[PDB]
Design a protein around this ligand. Sequence first.
Ligand code: NA
Length: 129
Amino acid sequence: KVFGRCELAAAMKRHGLDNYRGYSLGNWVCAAKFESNFNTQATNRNTDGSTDYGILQINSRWWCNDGRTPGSRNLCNIPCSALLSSDITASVNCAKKIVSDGNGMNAWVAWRNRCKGTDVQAWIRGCRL
Ligand code: NA
């Protein structure tokens, strides 16, 4: 599923991401735009041989099981394929664990490099939330 911007903003807010660990909804929408372009089916291989899955490009090195990431963990206790669903519940639940891990949203390098410190409220502009 390719989400619309406000469509994804509504879904993330319904699932309790607005101001989760102090991060406003536009931070999460901005992260999703630059991680996945709002595409639930996005997959990208990392140089370490792990893979990033779904709207928030959650990494198989730590968070989900894909069966092909030697020495990796599965801290969200989910198959990485569950992160590609049109229903973002699994991605959001797993994202809440990631952002709680100590470094907040710096875990998402695209958030740090492209969203952090920017006018992220622009990403929810015009949305009926
Ligand atoms: Na893994």
